[PDB]
C-alpha cells in the first residue's frame, strides 16, 4: 500500500529525464491508492452445532458475497492491505461435509 | 380373537433390530468377551444413504481413516470414494 507510492516517483523522474519537451507529466492523487474502501475487498452463532439444511443456506449466502470482496458473515478479510497478496480466515467450527 | 402373533422371518425393521441384538449377544457369550463389535443398529435406510454419498465428497464413517452387513456394502462404495 505504502510502498507502491515509492515505485511511482522513482519512474517519474526517469522519464522526466528521458523527454526534453514533456515537462511536468502528471499523476493521479493520492488518496485513490490510499483508501481501502474504492477496492473491491474491506451477533455471530456457532454455525456447527446447526442442522446441515439450515448450514448449506447459510454458508451459500455468506459466500456468495465474499466472491464480490465484501466480507461475509462469517468470514473476515486479515488485514494484509496492500499488495497482491490477501487472506481470509473463516468461521472454526462447522459440519465437514460441508466443510471441505 | 386375539391375532397369532407374526414369526421370526415376516417381521422386520424392528425385529431386524431385536433379532440382529440377539444374534450379537449370542455371539459374544460364545466366545468370551474378546468379540467385542459395539452397536447393532446405526443408521437408517435413507440417512445412512445420504452418509454414503457424503463419503464421496471425501469424509469416512468410523471404520475408516485416511445391521453389521453395512459393512459389506459399505467398502464397496468406500473404496470408490478413496
Redo the contacts between chains.
Keep these: 500500500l505504502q510502498q507502491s507510492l515509492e515505485l511511482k516517483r522513482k519512474m517519474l523522474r526517469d522519464k522526466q529525464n528521458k523527454k526534453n519537451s514533456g515537462q511536468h507529466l502528471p499523476i493521479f492523487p493520492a488518496w485513490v491508492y490510499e483508501r481501502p474502501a474504492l477496492i473491491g475487498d474491506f451477533t455471530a452463532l456457532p454455525i456447527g452445532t446447526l442442522p446441515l439444511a439450515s448450514q448449506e443456506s447459510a454458508v451459500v449466502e455468506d459466500l456468495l458475497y465474499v466472491l464480490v470482496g465484501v466480507d461475509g458473515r462469517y468470514v473476515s478479510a486479515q488485514p494484509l492491505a496492500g499488495r497482491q497478496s490477501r487472506t481470509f480466515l473463516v468461521d472454526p467450527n462447522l459440519d ?2 460441508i466443510r ?1 | 380373537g386375539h391375532r397369532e402373533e407374526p414369526y421370526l422371518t415376516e417381521a422386520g425393521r424392528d425385529a431386524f433390530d431385536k433379532f440382529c441384538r440377539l444374534h450379537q449377544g449370542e455371539l459374544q457369550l460364545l466366545a468370551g468377551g474378546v468379540l467385542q463389535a459395539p452397536q447393532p443398529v446405526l443408521v437408517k435406510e435413507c440417512e445412512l444413504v445420504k452418509d454414503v454419498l ?1 463419503v464421496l ?3 469416512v464413517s468410523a471404520t475408516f481413516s485416511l445391521p453389521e452387513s453395512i459393512s459389506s456394502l459399505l467398502s464397496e462404495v468406500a473404496e470408490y470414494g478413496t
Design positions: 465437514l461435509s471441505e | 457424503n465428497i471425501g469424509v
